[PDB]
Design a protein around this ligand. Structure first.
Ligand SMILES: [Mg+2]
Ligand SMILES: [Mg+2]
Ligand SMILES: [Mg+2]
Ligand SMILES: [Mg+2]
Ligand SMILES: [Mg+2]
Ligand SMILES: [Mg+2]
Ligand SMILES: [Mg+2]
Ligand SMILES: [Mg+2]
Ligand SMILES: [Mg+2]
Ligand SMILES: [Mg+2]
Ligand SMILES: [Mg+2]
Ligand SMILES: [Mg+2]
Ligand SMILES: [Mg+2]
Ligand SMILES: [Mg+2]
Ligand SMILES: [Mg+2]
Ligand SMILES: [Mg+2]
Ligand SMILES: [Mg+2]
Ligand SMILES: [Mg+2]
Ligand SMILES: [Mg+2]
Ligand SMILES: [Mg+2]
Ligand SMILES: [Mg+2]
Ligand SMILES: [Mg+2]
Ligand SMILES: [Mg+2]
Ligand SMILES: [Mg+2]
Ligand SMILES: [Mg+2]
Ligand SMILES: [Mg+2]
Ligand SMILES: [Mg+2]
Ligand SMILES: [Mg+2]
Ligand SMILES: [Mg+2]
Ligand SMILES: [Mg+2]
Ligand SMILES: [Mg+2]
Ligand SMILES: [Mg+2]
Ligand SMILES: [Mg+2]
Ligand SMILES: [Mg+2]
Ligand SMILES: [Mg+2]
Ligand SMILES: [Mg+2]
Ligand SMILES: [Mg+2]
Ligand SMILES: [Mg+2]
Ligand SMILES: [Mg+2]
Ligand SMILES: [Mg+2]
Ligand SMILES: [Mg+2]
Ligand SMILES: [Mg+2]
Ligand SMILES: [Mg+2]
Ligand SMILES: [Mg+2]
Ligand SMILES: [Mg+2]
Ligand SMILES: [Mg+2]
Ligand SMILES: [Mg+2]
Ligand SMILES: [Mg+2]
Ligand SMILES: [Mg+2]
Ligand SMILES: [Mg+2]
Ligand SMILES: [Mg+2]
Ligand SMILES: [Mg+2]
Ligand SMILES: [Mg+2]
Ligand SMILES: [Mg+2]
Ligand SMILES: [Mg+2]
Ligand SMILES: [Mg+2]
Ligand SMILES: [Mg+2]
Ligand SMILES: [Mg+2]
Ligand SMILES: [Mg+2]
Ligand SMILES: [Mg+2]
Ligand SMILES: [Mg+2]
Ligand SMILES: [Mg+2]
Ligand SMILES: [Mg+2]
Ligand SMILES: [Mg+2]
Ligand SMILES: [Mg+2]
Ligand SMILES: [Mg+2]
Ligand SMILES: [Mg+2]
Ligand SMILES: [Mg+2]
Ligand SMILES: [Mg+2]
Ligand SMILES: [Mg+2]
Ligand SMILES: [Mg+2]
Ligand SMILES: [Mg+2]
Ligand SMILES: [Mg+2]
Ligand SMILES: [Mg+2]
Ligand SMILES: [Mg+2]
Ligand SMILES: [Mg+2]
Ligand SMILES: [Mg+2]
Ligand SMILES: [Mg+2]
Ligand SMILES: [Mg+2]
Lengths: 120, 221, 116, 48
RNA sequence: AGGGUGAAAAGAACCCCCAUCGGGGAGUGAAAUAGAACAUGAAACCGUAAGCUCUCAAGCAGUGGGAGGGGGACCAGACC
RNA sequence: GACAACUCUCUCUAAGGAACUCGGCAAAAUAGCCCCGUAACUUCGGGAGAAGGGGUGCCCCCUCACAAAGGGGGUCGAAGU
RNA sequence: CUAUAACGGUCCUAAGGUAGCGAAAUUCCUUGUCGGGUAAGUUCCGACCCGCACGAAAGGCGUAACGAUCUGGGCACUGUCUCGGAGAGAGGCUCGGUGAAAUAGACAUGUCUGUGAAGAUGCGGACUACCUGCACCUGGACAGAAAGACCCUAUGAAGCU
RNA sequence: UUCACAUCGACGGGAAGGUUUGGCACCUCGAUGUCGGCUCUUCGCCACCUGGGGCUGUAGUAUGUUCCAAGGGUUGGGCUGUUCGCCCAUUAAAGCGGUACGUGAGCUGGGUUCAGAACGUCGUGAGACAGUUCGGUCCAUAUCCGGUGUGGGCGUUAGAGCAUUGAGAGGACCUUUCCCUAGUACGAGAGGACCGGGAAGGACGCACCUCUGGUGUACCAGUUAUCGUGCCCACGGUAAACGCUGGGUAGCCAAGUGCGGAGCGGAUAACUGCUGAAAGCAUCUAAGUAGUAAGCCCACCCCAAGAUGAGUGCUCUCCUA
RNA sequence: AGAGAAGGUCACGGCGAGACGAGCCGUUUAUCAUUACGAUAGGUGUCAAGUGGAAGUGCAGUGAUGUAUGCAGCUGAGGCAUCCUAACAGACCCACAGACUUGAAC
């Protein structure tokens, strides 16, 4: 449930701290987004002396949402924050390491992120 | 209209879940069945100009029926019943009065079925709930919040268009939910389990018949 | 719409409902027969049967509830003295309603209510 | 708003008779109440 | 701004409805259908009864044709 | 009495948080007392309650109550001006 | 080297704008241009100067403090918004009692497309339409309300210079 | 490249349309309230995307130009009072216009058109500028028509209770990406298909509350201050229309849960054709006939005999003297 | 004229139906059982469910307080039983075998 002007955290080693979604990708003329959906984002806080600057436009995918993610077996997932991970056109992350747990639903689209995660 | 096959009538009892063997969850709706499901009348083209068959349901005390309705059921030696509905067909060569209609003989498993019943009556509702209109500003001095706004252009045409989406009664009418999958049968309790939602609250009447598809079952036109 | 809502509103807020019905039971249990409207009488059956249900189980915990509900103090002490002998066999339906002509001022449907 | 013109005489009467017509249904209820009360058999209505 | 019972108050004993107001008879008077909020009492307006008549319509409402029905001191192939 | 729309006066509202809008209009938030700590600039008076942080209930003791404040210990709750 | 003109010449005035400031509460061209801020800035800040038409007590440039002043940005906050939803109260709705008002040529008061003082319920043609109420919404009746307050006229009126 | 007409097309010519700026000043001065925006529609095509074709200087992918086609769709933001327009990120595309530059007895009032004040400029001056700037009251209980819904009466030829045909009417038939076919056809290579099939989404619509949660002034619990129940304990009232908070069943609701959009059915438009005269040839046709569009009609969903053209079928009733 | 046909309306008790009308259910609540029809609402009983461990008493502690009795206590708009109360009394409208013609039957 990621609307534009939504402040997201960063999970990877990309060297950023905060993001701000401005558009959604993949969903035609949609305004919200769940985990696994790609977004366009704007950096607002970055780490000093890193390849990423403060006001760059990038692509990223949502990995954590405070909104609840329903499964088929009745299980539901909930996080206590909103976060994302930057990506390239192929979909691989720039950061070498990942923080936070990832859901198993991302293996069908983003398997590299599932491997680098500490837990699932 | 022309139905693809023959259906029956039941009562909504509630709604629950259904765990599969693998573990997937299925929001399932339950439908019971009263005593009477017997045929009352058989219509033909020679008499009425069309082929169909009546079906009664919900047996009740005989005193409650009007005496004309008694003679209609007493012709075929049929018990008293409250409701009556038809099932139009192409051929009725294999039906007679005083004939029971077991649903398990007609709906085995995983068969698509068209449910139809009365919806929940909302009453005299506005435009935002009925026609999904948008709302005006709640601040910035706006006086109109949940109003319609304009209901026409002006001097041309000079009148309000017919069928203008406006307030009125909402719900309480007949609808039909198409292509619902049947999950399970239970002949011990005389009950049937269907995936998805059903119009109305528990105790409401409905009709369930085989799913009709345009080019497959019914005669095209 | 009020689908599934079982509550008597009586054209009064909650603070006045909780006081109006609470005050009429004080008068019925001492007089045994009063003259009120039909809407007030219909809402009264739920609460009068409650206080009478407390007397069957005439314990100390059940008495403190009636004292908080019933305004006056002497009726509650007198209520538990007579009900076990008076309603030692009845199970519910501790009152009836008798209709009556309406008033002259507002045509309000009036009716009596009494303890069987 | 404001009325453009005045209502006629007979269109007025047709609207008044409807208001008066409610008395027809109120009289039947009273007659039903009396005949259901002059027998002294109803135990649900105390008239005094 | 608000005038007019009647020749004369003789302004209505008494009885019924009746808590009053008010009304119905009685009695008064040429007249009470002049009864006091009272003299002659037009029109708009609100009504009751009787004769014909409208619920597939549409129209500045009438007019020229006039089906069917009704009506009356003159008469009637007339008239309303 | 009843408890439709719609209007007004009020309360809460998941995820997000000015994307609304001419404009953060309106609403929301802040709030007391005791400590700590308070910038550029300045007419040296101010700025200043700057900002920004911590504590706050009840019970026992220290304590002699010294009107206080403070310290120590214990305890209830999601939440102590 | 272009480009500018420290400098010089000439005409006309009583004299030809000195300090400081400057697309400004002043800049027509104009969203001037460069830079900063924003993912993106006709607004805002800084600077340049081509000052249409700044300028020294109708004062000029700055200025701490103050402002229910104008103006831009940010933190926090939130139903402002995405996108609405639920609930309480007073009205609305029903019954009984009391009981107005603006308005009003008479009104048996449909739509379309034509016609017409050029925008018709009222005329023409076709279509549609049983009669009569109640609760709701206001497109039209060039609706109501104020002998247009804008413009013009009067050998009108008044205030001011 | 040669080749007027794949695509542009000078020089000039002939038209339609009534959305631009204007000319005329015919209706309105005892009043026809404005620019833009919000909300809510509805039509037109001179077609931005989606469907189907022709030509190409069309290899393929992707275009270009043009025909049929208006069924549906045509985003969210930054600046501006704006329209227009520029920019950011997306999208199948982010179409042009009419309806008093649609819509103020439906809304807003930022702009313009009052009174205050100020800068610049003009004027000796009062004052003035289609120059700028700060500020600045938008009334209204629907009579009729019209419109959304819901009743009654009467009629439908004796009077009724149920079940129904469907003339007519509406709603909805929308769309993106990926995979397979296939790295195949094509092409030197780069690069990369038509047709057909199968999945996952978007938007919209009809329903639902088992699930996740909102609200929940029925209810439960915690707690501050004060009054009262003789006092302690324990309770109740008030702190508007919960004193403030923490949870909450049913109900309602969406963010939640299911379903939906089908047809090798009919007739056509553009186009391609078959057969084949006038015209011994040729010709898609002035006989006949076949393929084929998100379009048209039916089919799908709901209403429906006030359909006065008032229907159809089953059943029932019509007593006494 | 009498009397009240089918059936409808009011009235009585209610609703997951509803602005009011309308629409739907019910109006003495059965007896038999292999079986389904005669519980409308409220109350009562019981169960699901919600809140989360009542009062009183005892124990521990100087005390605040904790702890045991105790899935307690309260609630129970919902489900199922139960006629305990109220659906009592009853009232109104309503019954010409369906005019006239023609044909085919009889
Ligand atoms: Mg930047
Ligand atoms: Mg309802
Ligand atoms: Mg909106
Ligand atoms: Mg408001
Ligand atoms: Mg008109
Ligand atoms: Mg009231
Ligand atoms: Mg209170
Ligand atoms: Mg006289
Ligand atoms: Mg007189
Ligand atoms: Mg007709
Ligand atoms: Mg007629
Ligand atoms: Mg929120
Ligand atoms: Mg905006
Ligand atoms: Mg904005
Ligand atoms: Mg404010
Ligand atoms: Mg506030
Ligand atoms: Mg401070
Ligand atoms: Mg400061
Ligand atoms: Mg100088
Ligand atoms: Mg500028
Ligand atoms: Mg200037
Ligand atoms: Mg701005
Ligand atoms: Mg500047
Ligand atoms: Mg100056
Ligand atoms: Mg000087
Ligand atoms: Mg000077
Ligand atoms: Mg000055
Ligand atoms: Mg000020
Ligand atoms: Mg409300
Ligand atoms: Mg209310
Ligand atoms: Mg009244
Ligand atoms: Mg008419
Ligand atoms: Mg003309
Ligand atoms: Mg015209
Ligand atoms: Mg005429
Ligand atoms: Mg006409
Ligand atoms: Mg209105
Ligand atoms: Mg006017
Ligand atoms: Mg004038
Ligand atoms: Mg004038
Ligand atoms: Mg002159
Ligand atoms: Mg024009
Ligand atoms: Mg013009
Ligand atoms: Mg006028
Ligand atoms: Mg075209
Ligand atoms: Mg124009
Ligand atoms: Mg306009
Ligand atoms: Mg208007
Ligand atoms: Mg303004
Ligand atoms: Mg001067
Ligand atoms: Mg302002
Ligand atoms: Mg207004
Ligand atoms: Mg009206
Ligand atoms: Mg109407
Ligand atoms: Mg049809
Ligand atoms: Mg259709
Ligand atoms: Mg739920
Ligand atoms: Mg539930
Ligand atoms: Mg809930
Ligand atoms: Mg005391
Ligand atoms: Mg309390
Ligand atoms: Mg208290
Ligand atoms: Mg008090
Ligand atoms: Mg109060
Ligand atoms: Mg409050
Ligand atoms: Mg809650
Ligand atoms: Mg709460
Ligand atoms: Mg050929
Ligand atoms: Mg040939
Ligand atoms: Mg031919
Ligand atoms: Mg097609
Ligand atoms: Mg009868
Ligand atoms: Mg009825
Ligand atoms: Mg019961
Ligand atoms: Mg439990
Ligand atoms: Mg205890
Ligand atoms: Mg429990
Ligand atoms: Mg129970
Ligand atoms: Mg029993």
């Amino acid at each position: 449930m990621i609307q534009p002007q939504t402040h997201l955290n960063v999970a990877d080693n990309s060297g950023a701290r905060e993001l701000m979604c401005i558009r959604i990708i993949g969903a035609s003329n949609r305004r919200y987004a769940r985990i696994g959906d790609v977004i366009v984002a704007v950096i607002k806080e970055a780490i000093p002396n890193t390849p990423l600057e403060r006001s760059e436009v990038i692509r990223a995918v949502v990995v954590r949402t405070c909104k609840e993610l329903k499964r088929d077996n009745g299980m539901i997932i909930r996080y206590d924050d909103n976060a994302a991970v930057i990506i390239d056109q192929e979909g691989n992350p720039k950061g070498t390491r990942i923080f936070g747990a990832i859901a198993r639903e991302l293996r069908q689209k983003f398997a590299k992120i599932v491997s680098l995660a500490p837990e699932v | 209209s022309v139905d693809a096959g023959i259906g029956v009538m039941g009562t909504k009892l509630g709604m629950m879940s259904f765990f599969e063997e693998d573990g997937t969850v299925v929001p399932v709706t339950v439908i019971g069945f009263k005593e009477g499901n017997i045929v009352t009348q058989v219509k033909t083209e020679s008499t009425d100009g069309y082929n169909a068959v009546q079906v009664g349901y919900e047996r009740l005390r005989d005193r409650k029926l009007t005496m004309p309705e008694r003679g209609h059921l007493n012709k075929a030696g049929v018990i008293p019943m409250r409701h009556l509905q038809e099932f139009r067909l192409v051929s009725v060569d294999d039906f007679t009065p005083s004939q029971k209609l077991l649903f398990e003989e007609l709906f085995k498993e995983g068969d698509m079925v068209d449910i139809s019943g009365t919806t929940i009556g909302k009453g005299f509702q506005g435009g935002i709930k009925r026609h999904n209109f948008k709302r005006g500003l709640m601040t910035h001095g706006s006086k109109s919040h949940r109003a319609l706004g304009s209901i026409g252009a002006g001097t041309t045409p000079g009148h309000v268009y017919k069928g203008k989406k406006m307030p009125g009664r909402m719900g309480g009418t007949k609808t039909k939910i198409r292509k619902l999958k049947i999950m399970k049968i239970d002949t011990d309790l005389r009950v049937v389990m269907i995936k998805g939602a059903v119009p109305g609250k528990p105790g409401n009447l409905l009709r369930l018949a085989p799913a009709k598809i345009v080019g497959k079952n019914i005669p095209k036109n | 719409m009020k689908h599934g809502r079982k509550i008597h509103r009586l054209s009064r807020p909650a603070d006045q409902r909780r006081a109006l019905l609470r005050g009429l039971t004080t008068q019925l249990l001492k007089h045994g027969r009063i003259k009120t409207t039909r809407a007030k009488a219909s809402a009264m059956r739920k609460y009068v049967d409650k206080m009478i249900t407390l007397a069957k189980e005439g314990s100390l915990h059940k008495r403190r509830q009636a004292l908080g509900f019933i305004y006056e103090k002497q009726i509650v002490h007198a209520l538990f003295a007579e009900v076990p002998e008076r309603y030692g066999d009845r199970n519910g339906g501790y009152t009836r309603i008798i209709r009556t002509l309406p008033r002259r001022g507002d045509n309000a449907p009036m009716a009596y209510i009494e303890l069987v | 708003a404001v009325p453009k013109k005045r209502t006629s005489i007979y269109k007025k009467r047709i609207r008044k008779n409807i208001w008066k017509k409610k008395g027809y249904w109120a009289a039947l209820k009273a007659f039903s109440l009396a005949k259901s009360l002059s027998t002294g058999n109803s135990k649900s209505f105390f008239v005094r």
